[PDB]
Amino acid sequence: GDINKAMFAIVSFETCKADLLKEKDRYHNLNKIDWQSSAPVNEPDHATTTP
Amino acid sequence: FTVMTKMPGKETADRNDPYGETGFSSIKWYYGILVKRPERLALIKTVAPL
Amino acid sequence: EHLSRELMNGATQITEAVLQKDLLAAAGTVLYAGAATSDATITGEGSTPS
C-alpha cells in the first residue's frame, strides 16, 4: 500500500528513432533493431489512440 | 482496415481451452464505388502479341 | 513481424485488384479493334485481326 516500498515499476511508451538519437551516448545497440518494418501492431498490450 | 491480433496467453483462454495456446490475426474492410459520369471512362479491347 | 507484413501487403494488393476490376466493368465508351463487336468476335486470325 505504499509506492515508496515498491521494488519496481514498468512503463511502455511510444518513441521514434530521432528521440533516441537526440542523445546518442545514453543509447547503444540501435543498429540491430528493424526500424523499417517493426510496428506497434505487433504489440497489442499497449493501449493507444494511434491508428 | 480493422487489424485484430489476439496473442495467445491471456485473452485466448476459454472454457474449451483453459490453456492459452492459440492465437490469430484478422484484417477486414468495406469497399464500394459510385459512378457519376460513365461516358468519361473509355476502353479499348484488343489482342496482344506474344 | 514478417507474417504481419506479408498479411498487410496481401490486403493492399487485393484492394487495388478489386478497384481495377470494377473500373473495367463499369466502362461507358468502348471500342473493339477491327470488325469485332463483342468479346466473342475478337480474333487474331482472319482478314481483319483485332
From Swiss-Prot, chain A:
Location of the protein in the cell: Virion
Assembly behavior: Homododecamer.
UniProt function note: Forms the portal vertex of the capsid. This portal plays critical roles in head assembly, genome packaging, neck/tail attachment, and genome ejection. The portal protein multimerizes as a single ring-shaped homododecamer arranged around a central channel.
Protein name: Probable portal protein
Curated annotation (Swiss-Prot), chain C:
Compartments where found: Virion
Coiled-coil intervals: none
Described function: Assembles, to form an icosahedral capsid with a T=9 symmetry, about 60 nm in diameter, and consisting of 535 capsid proteins.
The protein's name: Major capsid protein
UniProt source species: Enterobacteria phage N4 (Bacteriophage N4)
Name of the gene: 56
Residues of the whole record sequence present: 152 to 201 of 401
